[PDB]
């Protein structure tokens, strides 16, 4: 079953070996981003509609560990666009994706492009979570931000700051994702009185 999803997603992003010898002579434009996304979304929709409810989440953990196992950032952003349209079309419940994205242990701050693209996608898809899920996401995002040192490199700081926009979006009072009392309760549980 994870073999099925393995064959699907690996057959999505295969790379051509014999190209760069006789470059561009093969008669075939490789599916550009939109057609490839539509085909990927269709095949994953087949596997998802086939899938059972209780098996709904271990496959998502496999998806996110397969995305975080990648190395090319274009590949990662393509599969994140796939996950974004898979949430946006209504196929996926928009809480499992966010939780398995953040609680993935491959998400460390040293993987700065993965950090930036991940928290960009969570900024895109957090608007649909119910408020208790937003509260738990707030807690795990704060605990993810808490692992950064006092000093980091001067180039990675802007890609690290992508979590700050998710935090600013959750604690924004006009957006009203959750009651603000829950937000200050989670914060003051993590930064008690006297802690910067």
């Amino acid at each position: 079953m994870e073999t099925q999803l393995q064959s699907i997603f690996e057959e999505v992003v295969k790379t051509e070996v014999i190209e760069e010898a006789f470059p561009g002579m093969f008669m075939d434009t490789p599916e550009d981003e939109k057609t490839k996304l539509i085909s990927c979304l269709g095949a994953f929709r087949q596997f998802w509609g086939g899938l059972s409810q209780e098996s709904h989440e271990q496959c998502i953990q496999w998806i996110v560990k397969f995305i975080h196992g990648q190395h090319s950032p274009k590949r990662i952003s393509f599969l994140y666009d796939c996950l974004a349209m898979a949430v946006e079309t209504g196929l996926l419940p928009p809480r499992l994706v966010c939780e398995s994205l953040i609680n993935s242990d491959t998400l460390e701050w040293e993987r700065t492009q993965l950090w930036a693209l991940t928290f960009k996608l969570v900024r895109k898809i957090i608007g649909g979570v119910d408020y208790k899920g937003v509260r738990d996401l707030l807690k795990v995002i704060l605990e993810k931000i808490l692992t950064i040192p006092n000093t980091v490199s001067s180039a990675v700081v802007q890609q690290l700051l992508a979590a700050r926009e998710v935090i600013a979006y959750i604690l924004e009072r006009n957006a009203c994702l959750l009651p603000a009392y829950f937000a200050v309760t989670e914060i003051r549980k993590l930064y008690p009185e006297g802690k910067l």
Binding site: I18, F26, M27, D28
Partner: protein, 406 residues
């Protein structure tokens, strides 16, 4: 069903498929479709169309066949470079239009080499371009270009700070053009180059401070990044060569005579093994120059003896001479031009004779050439050693020493 399978003989498992189709508007013309097939009871693996831009030559067919035959050997080399964690740029069209090349960025640093020498090497490697040549298209050549050469030579190698070394590799007939042995041999040559760069850096650092006799006694001649040819002698005749043999993982020195004044040999061929071991234990070249300068003068005298006398090479600066088998004598060379001779068969401990035995009776002949008291050494000048060993007519042209033992 009307297709042609053009197999590539140089690089196997690759098949071009040329199919012909009828064009509807012209009943007297044909259309050609070219595909790149590959095979592993033959099993096909992948297939890809390739059809984009006297009349019997079909120019595009021969063009595609030549392009495939020229490009496909590079794919295996790229895969092998990627499999050994060697960061390399993709196959790129060279500036002179027609070509293919795989320029490496960084090599795996080394094993068994100090960190500072690794840094000095990594900051001097400018380019590691690989190219293909040779009939049947199966010879590879890597051109390494180093900068800031430590020390130059007597030859015309004192040009701009850019030394170009070409390393060629030709795999066997089997084991196709793209394989593991080529890059393995390349890494072996790189390791040898690094282990030699160790000694060249040591020598370059020690060049400003020289005991001032080895400077005129020895001179560097060539530096091809894989061999060190130093030359020593009063007339700059003798030559020693340093090289690292990765097969045995030990330094290999080769001695020769290049100069229009010398004996019949390098005169150091009797101490070649002890010098090999000496340089293998402590890789320092200034010690080699010093011991050569110290031991050349006694060796020039000990080589001209009649070959009766037998030369047993013991540890360095301890050459043994033995008239017949009954007699013996030890040659202890030391600095400042002195040699200490011994009784030979005598034992440096409890007074018992060795297997050869036959205690040399006179002993005091060495004292005038200035009971068991031959066992203690007697120093000389190398000039008294010249007189004691070069054959003078008698006070047949025999030596003094062989007259004594005779």
């Amino acid at each position: 069903k009307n297709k042609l399978f053009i197999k590539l003989t140089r690089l196997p498992q690759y098949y071009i498929v040329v199919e012909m189709l009828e064009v509807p508007n012209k009943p007297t013309q044909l259309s050609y479709k070219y595909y790149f097939m590959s095979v592993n009871p033959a099993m096909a693996l992948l297939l890809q169309q390739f059809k984009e831009n006297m009349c019997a030559f079909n120019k595009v067919l021969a063009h595609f066949v030549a392009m495939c035959d020229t490009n496909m050997p590079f794919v295996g080399l790229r895969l092998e470079l990627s499999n050994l964690e060697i960061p390399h740029q993709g196959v790129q069209v060279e500036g002179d239009g027609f070509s293919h090349a795989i320029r490496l960025l960084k090599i795996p640093p080394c094993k068994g080499i100090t960190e500072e020498t690794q840094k000095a090497l990594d900051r001097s490697l400018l380019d590691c371009t690989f190219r293909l040549q040779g009939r049947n298209n199966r010879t590879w050549v890597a051109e390494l270009v180093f900068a800031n050469c430590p020390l130059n030579g007597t030859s015309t190698r004192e040009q701009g700070p850019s030394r170009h070394v070409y390393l060629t590799y030709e795999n066997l007939l089997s084991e196709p053009v793209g394989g593991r042995k080529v890059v393995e041999m390349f890494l072996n040559d790189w390791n040898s180059i690094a282990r030699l760069y160790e000694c060249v850096l040591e020598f370059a650092r020690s060049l400003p401070d020289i005991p001032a006799h080895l400077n005129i006694f020895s001179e560097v001649r060539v530096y091809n990044y894989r061999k060190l040819i130093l030359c020593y002698g009063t007339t700059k005749g003798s030559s020693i060569s340093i090289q690292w043999n990765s097969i045995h993982q030990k330094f290999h020195i080769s001695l020769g005579t290049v100069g229009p004044n010398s004996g019949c040999s390098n005169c150091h061929n009797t101490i070649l093994h002890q010098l090999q071991e000496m340089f293998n234990k402590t890789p320092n070249v200034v010690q080699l120059l010093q011991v050569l300068f110290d031991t050349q003068a006694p060796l020039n005298a000990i080589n001209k003896l009649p070959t009766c006398f037998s030369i047993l090479p013991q540890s360095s600066t301890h050459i043994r001479l033995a008239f017949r088998n009954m007699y013996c004598i030890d040659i202890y060379c030391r600095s400042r031009g002195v040699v200490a001779i011994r009784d030979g068969a005598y034992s440096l401990f409890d007074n018992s004779k060795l297997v050869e035995g036959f205690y040399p009776a006179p002993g005091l002949k060495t004292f005038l050439n200035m009971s068991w008291a031959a066992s203690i050494p007697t120093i000389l000048t190398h000039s008294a050693l010249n007189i004691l060993l070069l054959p003078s007519p008698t006070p047949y042209l025999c030596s003094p020493l062989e007259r004594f033992l005779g």
